[PDB]
Amino acid sequence: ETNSKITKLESSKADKSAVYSKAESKIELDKKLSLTGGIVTGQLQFKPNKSGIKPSSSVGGAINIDMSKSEGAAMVMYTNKDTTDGPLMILRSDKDTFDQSAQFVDYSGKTNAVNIVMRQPSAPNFSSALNITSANEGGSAMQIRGVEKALGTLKITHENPNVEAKYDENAAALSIDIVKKQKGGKGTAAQGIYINSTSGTAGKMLRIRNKNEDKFYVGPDGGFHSGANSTVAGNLTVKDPTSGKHAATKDYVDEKIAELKKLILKKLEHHHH
Amino acid sequence: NSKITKLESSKADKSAVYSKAESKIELDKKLSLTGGIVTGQLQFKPNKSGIKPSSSVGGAINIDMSKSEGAAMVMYTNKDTTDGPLMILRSDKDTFDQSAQFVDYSGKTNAVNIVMRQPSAPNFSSALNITSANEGGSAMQIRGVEKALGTLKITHENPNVEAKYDENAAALSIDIVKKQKGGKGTAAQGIYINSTSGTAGKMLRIRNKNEDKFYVGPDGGFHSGANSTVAGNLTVKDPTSGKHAATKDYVDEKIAELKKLILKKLEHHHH
Amino acid sequence: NSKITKLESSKADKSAVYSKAESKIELDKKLSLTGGIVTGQLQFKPNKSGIKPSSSVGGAINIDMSKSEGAAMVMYTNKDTTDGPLMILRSDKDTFDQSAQFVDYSGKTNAVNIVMRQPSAPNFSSALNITSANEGGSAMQIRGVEKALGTLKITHENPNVEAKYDENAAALSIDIVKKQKGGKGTAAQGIYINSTSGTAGKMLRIRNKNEDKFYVGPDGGFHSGANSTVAGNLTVKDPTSGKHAATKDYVDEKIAELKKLILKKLEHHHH
Ligand code: NI
């Protein structure tokens, strides 16, 4: 009865058929993502349940990338495809009650928080670096606020794309269009540019300069200064003049003519020989 | 007997099989679907993988937050300095016919929010910086349908309590420059305002302290609220009302009229 | 008679190894490189891991769509309300010397597109909101090289069919305000238009129905297309042409000139 041992070896020990070898384990493990990194070739879906995903801008998110301890970018999305069927990155919210932003960038630093560069195409096309559209009539499509000491809150620079001076004659730095409703619109009373100072400013409201020479401005009181010959295709209403170079009114001309007429008729009616 | 042979065949060698503990060691190096911490680079290289453009179910990465609280993704850094931006989107072919980023937003607050915090020391940075080298298209476009607001709203706030501190600031600053390399000039315009369908509103309206100071109407007439100056001549129509500016012709027209009548009285004077 | 000791040693016990079925259970809780569904938080904490800034191969996450259709990543939510934004980029140190986001775009359509859909009810919300507390730099900069378009193009569309519905709207709205906490005023300007190199084009050009109504030329002269008013005096040069506005000096000189001439005719006539 020496086989009271072989039976207990036949029972208590694992059959190769019923267990993975290390070579087979490696095969299986190699199809799984290592925490040290790997290459995913399919779709990675995130569907958090009662997972405790938080809104914190430091430790929150279904994906959280903390670069505090590392050089490099948090995420890079690259494509050299000639054409494709969708954008690289999509953010979408469907419910009208949604009360948060699609994207919030909270930037401290010494350079531009967000940088959008459109490279030069082989052939010009109507594409833009950034395109904004809103169908909400209750709010501005876009808002900008800044606290600049000596610069514009919005700075627009147009550079001539060509060496020849007369190439960009139809270009502008700022182009504004005011249109009626596309489907069935009967017109519009919308304004072009509205400049206001709710608290009141001492500065010029509109100031135009060319080649380091000021050319035209509208002051804080609404008076304008034009730097060259000007034209009104129409009448201009002004105050009566009280100084030599003030424009003369029709009334002023007529009063001075009438005054001289009276004096001369006086002399004529009373002169003798 | 020969029982041993069978057990030498059908039984597992310790050397060729991972133990329970060893298996735990190996499995812990793999990401659990319930979550984990990745310390290396995660690369996505889909290639005939059925990736879709769908703005709901598409993407090599898809994050659906419909049933959950919190952000979809947070990118955070407390590093003092580094060698690259947090997030980069890049497409290299000029024939590429989709956007780098598409925001399709419904909701009650701002779709995209960009905040530049107050730095310890003022610097030249901007919250958003746009450059285009495509001469065939606007660098940026904005379209809106506001009832009673601006499509673009610009607010400049004085950074200082003192009133004259921001005397060189502006809400909108425009520069018009020649080509950097070898440019001979430019004929580009500053501000171009048009209404292709035609509007009844003021083209330009200027106010200060809630009161109208200067405006240009839809017909191109202007209304100025204070004393004004033309460093030059101003051409106007002949006046037909008391406060209309008088032309040189009108002054000369009247002078000649009075001259004629007086000389006629003088030539026919009778004692 | 002692091999049994060698097999008790060299062979794996049932208790100390996982079966094929139990291995499967454990492996099924791990993410396959072929794809899967993550239900918890995935944290990235690289730390001397060789993460690079490269806009092609860098990032703790890298998505290369060169060989695949579809989007790189999609963030979707159908939630009614929530406690934070979908995507957050945050940098905390004021010495941070890289951007939060860099888009390096080549292609034929818009690099970044932001769309706010029509809400059930109008509300005070924007597609894009920009705010800087950095007094040393513009909140926003735009540069373009357009041949025949605006670097910035703003379109306001009437939200309603009725022509006067949008009478209080504008394409561009500018406000100039004092410092909120204790500000005593501001000297900031509204719109500053300049050409540092000098341009031949009109600085301000206003049109209605594609026809010029008002413009300021490169020399600062203006043309108004209709009746206009100055609530004040207008200073001009003395006229040298028929339709030039007449000065007070010119009126007085011509009146005095005729007076003299008439009085000398009267002083010397005889009959
Ligand atoms: Ni006589």
Output the CA A69–ligand 1 centroid distance in Å. 111
Closest by CA position to B186, among listed C269, A255, C178, C202: C202
A122 CB-near residues (< 8 Å, 6+ apart) = B94
* Closest-CA residue of chain C to A131: C113
Check if C25 contacts A (Cβ < 8 Å). no
Q: Rounded CA gap, C248 and A252, in Å?
A: 8
Tell if the CB–CB gap between B38 and C42 is shorter than 8 Å. yes
Distance of CA A104 to the CA centre of its chain: 14
> If 0-12 CB within 10 Å is exposed, 13-18 middle and 19+ buried, where does residue B54 land?
middle
Rounded to whole angstroms, the Cα distance separating B252 from B234 reads: 17
User: Is C247's CB within 8 Å of A245's CB?
Assistant: yes
B chain contacts of residue C38, beta-carbon cutoff 8 Å: 33-35
The verdict on C270 touching A (C-beta cutoff 8 Å) is yes
A148 contacts in C (CB within 8 Å)? Answer: 135-139
Shortest CA distance to B212 belongs to which of B199, B226, B197?
B226
Closest residue of chain B to A22, computed from CA coordinates? B17
Report residue C110 as tokens: 């818009």
- CA of B263 from ligand 1 middle (Å) equals 12
Experimental technique for the deposited model: X-ray
Asked if B208 has any chain A CB less than 8 Å from its own CB, the reply is yes
Distance C271 CA to ligand 1 centre (A): 6
Q: How far apart, in whole angstroms, are the C-alpha atoms of residue B147 and residue C122?
A: 9
Question: Per-residue b/e over A260-273, b at no fewer than 16 CB within 10 Å?
Answer: beeebeeeeeeeee
Q: Determine, for residues B38 and C44 on separate chains, whether the beta-carbon distance falls below 8 Å.
A: yes
SS (H, E, C) chain A: CCCHHHHHHHHHECEHHHCCCHHHHHHHHHCECECCEEEECCCEEECCCCCCCCCCCCCCCCEEEECCCCCCCCEEEEECCCCCCCCCEEEEECCCCCCCCCEEEEECCCCCCEEEEECCCCCCCCCCCEEEEECCCCCCCEEEEECCCCCEEEEEEEECCCCCCCCCCCCEEEEEEEECCCCCCCCECCEEEEEECCCCECCCCEEEEECCEEEEEECCCCCEEECCCEEECCCEECCCCCCCCEECEHHHHHHHHHHHHHHHHHHHHHCCC
Task: Locate C249 and state its tokens.
Answer: 């000096």
Is C122 an 8 Å CB contact of chain A?
yes
| Interface contact B98, partner C, CB < 8 A | yes
* C 129-168 → B contacts, CB under 8 A: 129-147, 149-160, 163-168
Question: C-alpha angle with apex C36: C31 to C39, nearest 5 degrees?
Answer: 85
Tell me the nearest-neighbour CA distance from A177 into chain C, angstroms: 5
What SS3 class is residue C221?
coil
Chain C residues touching residue B126 (CB < 8 angstroms): 132, 134, 137-141
Chain position carrying tokens 């891991």: C49
Kindly identify which residue of chain A lies nearest to residue C256, measuring between CA atoms. A260
CA distance C188 to A176: 23
Cα distance between residue C184 and residue B151, in whole Å: 29
The answer to whether B160 and C179 are in contact (CB under 8 A) is yes
Of A64, A94, A200, the CB nearest to C78: A94
CA angle C213, C214, C218 (to 5 degrees): 135
Question: Least CA distance to C257: which residue of chain B?
Answer: B255
Helix (H, G, I), strand (E, B) or coil at B20: helix
Taking contacts as CB-CB distances below 8 angstroms, the residues of chain C near A6 are: 4
Contacts of C232 in chain B (CB under 8 A): 224-228
* Cβ neighbours of residue C268 closer than 8 Å, sequence gap 6 or more: none
Closest alpha carbon to A193 in C174, B197, B214: C174
**Residues from chain B contacting residue C186 (CB–CB below 8 Å):** 156-158, 163, 166
Q: Which residue has the tokens 């005939």?
A: B48
Chain position carrying tokens 């002023």: A252
Find chain A residues with C-beta within 8 A of B101's C-beta: 87-91
How much distance in Å is there from the Cα of C267 to the middle of ligand 1? Answer: 9
Amino acid (1-letter code) at residue B180 = Q
- CA–CA distance, A10 with A6 (Å, rounded to integer): 6
Whether residues C87 and A104 touch (CB distance < 8 A) is answered with: yes
Residue with tokens 């094929």: C20
Residues 39-68 of A with CB under 8 A from B: 39-49, 51, 53-68
DSSP letter (8 states) at residue B186: B
SS3 C49: coil
CB of C5 less than 8 A from some CB of B: no
Round the CA-based radius of gyration of chain A to a whole number and report it: 39
Q: With an 8 Å Cβ cutoff, are C265 and B266 in contact?
A: yes
Tokens linked to C267: 């002083």
B260 CA: distance to closest CA in chain C (Å)? 11
Q: What is the resolution of this structure in A?
A: 2.2
Q: Which two tokens stand for residue A246?
A: 């003030």
- Separation CA B145–CA A137 (nearest Å): 5
Tokens of B140: 């940026």
Residue A4 is encoded by which pair of tokens? 């009271």
Q: Ligand 1 centroid to C268 CA: how many Å?
A: 9
Residue in chain C nearest A91 by alpha carbon: C75
Token pair of C24, please? 């499967």
d(CA B137, CA A129): 9
| Residue of A232, B262, A172, A113 lying closest to C99 (CA atoms) | A113
Q: Say how many Å lie between the CA of residue B271 and the centre of ligand 1.
A: 7
* Residue matched to tokens 């042409």: C241
User: With helix as H, strand as E and coil as C, how does B45-76 read?
Assistant: CCCCCCCCCCCCCCCCEEEECCCCCCCCEEEE
Nearest to B258 among C7, C207, C258 (CB): C258
C22 and B CB contact within 8 Å: no
Domain locations in chain C as residue ranges: 235-271
Q: Which residues of B touch A180 (CB under 8 A)?
A: 197-198
Distance A265 CA to ligand 1 centre (A): 13
Whether A71 and chain B come into contact, CB under 8 Å, resolves to: yes
- HSE (side-chain half, CA atoms, 13 Å) at C56: 4
Strand-pairing partners, residue C74, are: A90, B62
β-sheet bridge partners, residue C129: A143, B113
> Which 3 state secondary structure label does DSSP give C40?
coil
User: Which of A35, A70, A81, C186 is CA-nearest to residue B100?
Assistant: A81
CB contact residues (below 8 A), chain C span 227-246, against chain B:
227-237, 239-246
Q: Which residues on A lie below 8 Å from C63 (Cβ)?
A: 75-78
